Design a protein around this ligand. Structure first.
Ligand SMILES: [Mg+2]
Ligand SMILES: [Mg+2]
Ligand SMILES: [Mg+2]
Ligand SMILES: [Mg+2]
Ligand SMILES: [Mg+2]
Ligand SMILES: [Mg+2]
Ligand SMILES: [Mg+2]
Ligand SMILES: [Mg+2]
Ligand SMILES: [Mg+2]
Ligand SMILES: [Mg+2]
Ligand SMILES: [Mg+2]
Ligand SMILES: [Mg+2]
Ligand SMILES: [Mg+2]
Lengths: 62, 100, 144, 66, 142, 75, 141, 185, 57, 57
RNA sequence: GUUAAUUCCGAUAACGAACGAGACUCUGGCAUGCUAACUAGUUACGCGACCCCGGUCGGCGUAACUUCUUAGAGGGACAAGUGGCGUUCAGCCACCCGAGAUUGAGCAAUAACAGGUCUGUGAUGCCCUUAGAUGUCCGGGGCUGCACGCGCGCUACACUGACUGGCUCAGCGUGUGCCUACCCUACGCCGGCAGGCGCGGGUAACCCGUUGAACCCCAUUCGUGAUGGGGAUCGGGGAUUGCAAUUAUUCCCCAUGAACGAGGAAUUCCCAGUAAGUGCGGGUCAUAAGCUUGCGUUGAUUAAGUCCCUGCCCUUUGUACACA
């Protein structure tokens, strides 16, 4: 598994039972025309970069 | 001749009414005055359990009594200030005028 | 200055009771009952002994001085208020009672209260709190 | 949580109904013309009525109000 | 010339410190003693932040004597940290150009803006039914 | 279980060891010297004051909590 | 040169302790050895030359502000008394060591009984403390 | 005057934050360069203004835990001062650089949370927070019941975290945390 | 009880008041403790104006 | 005053005076419309004003 | 749709109203502008002490002033300005300006519980007792009693520490009482200490008191050992209060040195000067804080979210429930 970092481009909602994992969509920085949607744990604003351990997991949207 | 007046009340507006009235009385009987100095308000605070019995959530009243005290100094003779203090006082304000 | 000197005593012998010499003297004398923190410090204040020494680098002259000052306290200008057996109920002698006599004086006081049949002796013999505490909630350790 | 209540909104609509000419655009001026023209027994309510007067008069220079 | 004395307060939690700046040489001392022995000396660059951020050339013609009262140790040391900078900024307000005032002020603010404005925070009141301001005692069932 | 039987004064082997290796360390705190050389913290502080007095190591900061020492610069 | 507030106080007090030891005029009591220095302490002082040091310290306090006495010096040299399994409190110092140290600092004339109660330091003692403040500044330069 | 130096002894340039990921949440640069790790505070009014506090003050804040040391900030500034000094003599580089590389190395890249569990990538601010917290608690319980003082526990563990030797408590919990994340992905 | 409370209500509203509230609590119509409530007009309950608009007894 | 009472307990002492005065007049003149009292003090004499309904009684 | 809100915009077989929310009061935060101050001060000026012109002083006095202190009247902030989002309504987000762009409490509706109080009352129905009293008083005892279970807490398990010196900082408050006999104390001596004996101040911005408080800061000693951690238990002595302390009232001195190595199932409080650490005042009080109520002081980790568990409110729906 290669390590890829990607920039949050819009924050969408909170997911999880205790309302703890902020669901955002990100776009990868080398493949800037590509996007994915990730459940992200913690304090997240728009415009920060996440270190994805894998590019390919994509979650549901509630 | 350095006769001093102290004004003391639980009320603030009546006290300051009486003190400004005495300042204007001293001015119309034409003698200088060191102004009404305001010493700090003494609070009398009481915290009691609201309940007569023992049970309940342990709640507490917070009763307060504010006491205001102010001072007026006059270099003047005695009957002038005696006849100015014989008039124009509210019931809430205690007046104490000493000579020395 | 810091090397082990020869004849370094790892242990000493005072009133048939051991004195660990690896510690420091003001706290090594404390190992026998009847002398503690402050009485140990004051006894070796009266004895001309530097407090920085450890109890294995003393000499037998100095430990003889220390044991004489502990056994005869008030004629080395230890005050009367600094003792533990002040005005005792047999001979009235102000002296510091030490290790093997300490439990003797304790148990003689115990037997005096027993055969005098007082309340505090009854509480001792019953195995209770003799100094007026509460037994309803605290002290369930020894008595089941 | 800044919602002007009915005692603010009703009074501001009455002020702008009967005194639209002297009211203007800035909070500090029409605050004191509202304090001259009404009996508002507290400064906090006075300021909130004045601010809502400013806001809906900006709505009036947008267009007509219901 | 005339005595160019400005007396400025600096406020932390309850420790208030009024500084007093005149025409003179660069004499900065607080409560009759210099800055370099004011305990706690852990916060020694806290006192030195106005003089280190501005240089002694700006503190050259100004002697500042500070009297401090109230609060605790670091509250006093933050009140002195505020009061020196505010005393210098009021001297440069009233007796020289205000281009100097603006450059001294934004050099202060671009490091730390609590050098000039204060903390309005104080210890809030203990409500009943708790050990402190908003902690409560331990509720127990069964 | 385990009990550090640290020796409270130097025997000849450990005194010669402290003269040997301890002026070559980078970090010389008494807590380091105690674990590396089997001694008390007190005897460590006394030995390190002795080494500073002889002039074989160098003070860096002295504090009520701990003291920190280096070896000398080699050049 | 400098004065007492111009230098650090914590080596000022050991300088004045060494100065009073050098004079040897202070007249310590006999119960220097067998004392616990206040109620809230637990042991005797570790330093055996402590009377000269507390004499230095209370001379410095009387230089910084006068009109202080036995109760004031117990208020300075008080501290935390740990009461075992109860919460700790503040406890005053020893009255007798403050009384003896003020009698010693008025024995060698560095302090003097003032009006309105208490002690204030004499100009000779003030001169000595200023001299050794100059000496402390010289030792640290 | 330019070149504000942290504790007077360490310059706030000469640092490359080798994450473009954790770049804006570790504050060592010139507008975030202070003299002390002691500021006035008031970083807890808004949400992300926690990340405006510099990393030295934030380490100093996160150290003073477990009851007996709540709000001993002067004390923890003392600990960070001796810790940076011991980092400098024991390593030979910038102590702030050792701190930044320790944060970069010790921040867990992803964690697992219940949505059983599910692996989720973490926020950069949250992995900064958890990195600081793991470093502080490793130093603390290395120091507990030991001759080893905390002012060099924190130093030795920032060395072991900047090297990533799995000899640090922080790097061990980071590895086992993203291990459990790799199980729950 | 009811016509006495009605009489007090109508009397003091004729005497001129923005409102009134009469509560008679106790044993009424039997040995059970009941309560009777008689409200008319304006009656603020909270805040600071209950110290100078409500006369209570 | 030669015993020289302090102001803090002075205001609560004449407060508790006005309290037991009001309660005494309440227990006596309840039959005759006792509304309240007002106590106002001068030197050497003190005007205390019962304010009630049936002044004739 | 929107808000902390039955808060508003708005829809409309409803219209016009009332309470609650809000409004209000106190508090907090900001004014170098106003009012003034020998029961608060600053700055100068003049004497005084000291250091090699200048510096220090809470050393002594007076000519200005009120920034600091006190407290009064006004002000000040309104989502007002700007940029987005929204029917471009109600309003939300962000930002400049700014002492503040959510400080904290008090008050708090309709209806109700067979919740507590007859042990707060001279508020009280009824019953019972009423001279061998269940009235009142005095003497003594008990309310504390210990195989055990539970709850609120304080001290701790130490090196981020203990001990010993040194240095230097608060804000609440209270203080000589109707009966009522018992106040807060500087200062000078005696005593290790608890304390004792004298002359003084204060009915209080005056005197305690500039409240020289602790953690804290600095410098020692201790060295990972139930240890200089911890101080329970216990022996002997010395004081104070009482009319009297024994079942140790409280404190002091020495000696005794236990469990306790961060706590299982479970469970509490909390998000900014907050939690926690720390000490000081009030009540209780002749003696008297392991309590509680206030107060400062050092002062953060984390969060700006959700309906997951525990619950609350509104709508729809189901009911064989209605002491639900
Ligand atoms: Mg003290
Ligand atoms: Mg340790
Ligand atoms: Mg209302
Ligand atoms: Mg309300
Ligand atoms: Mg019931
Ligand atoms: Mg019968
Ligand atoms: Mg009981
Ligand atoms: Mg102990
Ligand atoms: Mg009792
Ligand atoms: Mg022990
Ligand atoms: Mg719960
Ligand atoms: Mg109680
Ligand atoms: Mg069905």
């Amino acid at each position: 598994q290669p390590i890829k970092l990607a920039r949050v481009t819009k924050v969408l909602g909170r997911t999880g039972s205790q309302g703890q994992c902020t669901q955002v969509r990100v776009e990868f920085m080398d493949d800037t025309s590509r996007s994915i949607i990730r459940n992200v744990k913690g304090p997240v604003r728009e415009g920060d970069v996440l270190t994805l351990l894998e590019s390919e997991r994509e979650a549901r949207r509630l | 001749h350095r006769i001093r007046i102290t004004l003391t009340s639980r009320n603030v507006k009546s006290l300051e009414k009486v003190c400004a009235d005495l300042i204007r009385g001293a001015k119309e009987k034409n003698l200088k005055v060191k102004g009404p100095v305001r010493m700090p308000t003494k609070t009398l605070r009481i915290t009691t359990r609201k309940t007569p019995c023992g049970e309940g959530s342990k709640t507490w009243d917070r009763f307060q009594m504010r006491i205001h005290k102010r001072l007026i100094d006059l270099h003047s003779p005695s009957e002038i200030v005696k006849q100015i203090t014989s008039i124009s006082i509210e019931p809430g304000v205690e007046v104490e005028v000493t000579i020395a | 200055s810091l090397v082990i000197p020869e004849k370094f005593q790892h242990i000493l012998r005072v009133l048939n009771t051991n004195i660990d010499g690896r510690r420091k003297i003001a706290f090594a004398i404390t190992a026998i009952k009847g002398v503690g923190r402050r009485y140990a410090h004051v006894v070796l204040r009266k004895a001309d002994i530097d407090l920085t020494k450890r109890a294995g680098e003393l000499t037998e002259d100095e430990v003889e001085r220390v044991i004489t000052i502990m056994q005869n306290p008030r004629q080395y200008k230890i005050p009367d208020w600094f003792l533990n057996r002040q005005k005792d109920v047999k001979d009235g002698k102000y002296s510091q009672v030490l290790a093997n006599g300490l439990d003797n004086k304790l148990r003689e006081d115990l037997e005096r209260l027993k055969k005098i049949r007082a309340h505090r002796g009854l509480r001792h013999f019953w195995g209770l709190r003799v100094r007026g505490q509460h037994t309803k909630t605290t002290g369930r350790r020894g008595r089941t | 949580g800044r919602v002007r209540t009915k005692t603010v909104k009703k009074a501001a609509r009455v002020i702008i109904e009967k005194y639209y000419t002297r009211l203007g655009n800035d909070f500090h001026t029409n605050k004191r013309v509202c304090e001259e023209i009404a009996i508002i027994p507290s400064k906090k309510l006075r300021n909130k009525i004045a601010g809502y007067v400013t806001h809906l008069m900006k709505r009036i220079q947008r267009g007509p109000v219901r | 010339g005339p005595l160019q004395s400005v007396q400025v307060f600096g406020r932390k939690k309850t420790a208030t410190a009024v500084a007093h700046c005149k025409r003179g040489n660069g004499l900065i001392k607080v409560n009759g003693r210099p800055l370099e022995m004011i305990e706690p000396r852990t916060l020694q660059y806290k006192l030195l932040e106005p003089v280190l951020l501005l240089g002694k050339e700006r503190f050259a013609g100004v002697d500042i004597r500070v009297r401090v009262k109230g609060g605790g140790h670091v509250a006093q040391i933050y009140a002195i940290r505020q009061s020196i900078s505010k005393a210098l900024v009021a001297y440069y307000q009233k007796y020289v150009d205000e281009a100097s005032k603006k450059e001294i002020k934004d050099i202060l603010i671009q490091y730390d803006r609590t050098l000039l404005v204060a903390d309005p925070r104080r210890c809030e009141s203990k409500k009943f039914g708790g050990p402190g301001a908003r902690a409560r005692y331990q509720k127990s069932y069964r | 279980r385990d009990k550090l039987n640290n020796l409270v004064l130097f025997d000849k082997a450990t005194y010669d060891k402290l003269c040997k290796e301890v002026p070559n360390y980078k970090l010389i705190t008494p807590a380091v010297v105690s674990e590396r050389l089997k001694i008390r913290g007190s005897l460590a502080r006394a030995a390190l004051q002795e080494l500073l007095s002889k002039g074989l190591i160098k003070l860096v900061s002295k504090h009520r909590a701990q003291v920190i020492y280096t070896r000398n610069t080699k050049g | 040169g400098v004065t007492v507030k111009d230098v650090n106080q914590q080596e000022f007090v050991r300088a004045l302790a060494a100065f009073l030891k050098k004079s040897g005029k202070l007249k310590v009591p006999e119960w220097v050895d067998t004392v616990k220095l206040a109620k809230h302490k637990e042991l005797a002082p570790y330093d055996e030359n402590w009377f000269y040091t507390r004499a230095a310290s209370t001379a410095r306090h009387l230089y910084l502000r006068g009109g202080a006495g036995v109760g004031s010096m117990t208020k300075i040299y008080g501290g935390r008394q740990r009461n075992g399994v109860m919460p700790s409190h503040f406890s005053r110092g020893s009255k007798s060591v403050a009384r003896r140290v003020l009698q010693a600092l008025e024995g060698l004339k560095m302090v003097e009984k003032d009006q309105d109660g208490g002690r204030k330091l004499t100009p000779q003692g003030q001169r000595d403390l200023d001299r050794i403040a100059g000496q402390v500044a010289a030792a640290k330069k | 005057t330019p070149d504000i130096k942290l504790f007077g002894k360490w310059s706030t340039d000469d640092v490359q934050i080798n994450d473009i990921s954790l770049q804006d949440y570790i504050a060592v640069k010139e507008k975030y360069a202070k003299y002390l790790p002691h500021s006035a505070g008031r970083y807890a009014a808004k949400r992300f203004r926690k990340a405006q506090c510099p990393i030295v003050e934030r380490l100093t804040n996160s150290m003073m835990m477990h009851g007996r040391n709540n709000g001993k900030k002067l004390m923890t500034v003392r600990i960070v001062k001796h810790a940076f000094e011991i980092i400098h003599l024991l390593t030979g580089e910038n102590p702030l650089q050792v701190l930044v590389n320790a944060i970069i190395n010790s921040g867990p890249r992803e964690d697992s949370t219940r949505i059983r569990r599910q692996a989720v990538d973490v926020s950069p601010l949250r992995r900064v927070n958890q990195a600081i917290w793991l470093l502080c608690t490793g130093a603390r319980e290395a120091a507990f019941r030991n001759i080893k003082t905390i002012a060099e526990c924190l130093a030795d563990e920032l060395i072991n975290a900047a090297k990533g030797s799995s000899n640090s408590y922080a790097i061990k919990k980071k590895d086992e945390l993203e291990r459990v994340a790799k199980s729950n992905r | 009880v009811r016509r006495a409370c009605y009489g007090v209500l109508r009397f003091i509203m004729e005497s001129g008041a923005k409102g009134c509230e009469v509560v008679v609590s106790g044993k009424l119509r039997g040995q059970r403790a009941k309560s009777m409530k008689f409200v008319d007009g304006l009656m603020i309950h909270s805040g600071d104006p209950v110290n100078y608009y409500v006369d209570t007894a | 005053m030669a015993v020289q009472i302090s102001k803090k307990r002075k205001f609560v002492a004449d407060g508790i005076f006005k309290a037991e005065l009001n309660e005494f007049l309440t227990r006596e003149l309840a039959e005759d419309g006792y509304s309240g009292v007002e106590v106002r003090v001068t030197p050497t004499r003190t005007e205390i004003i019962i304010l009630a309904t049936r002044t004739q009684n």
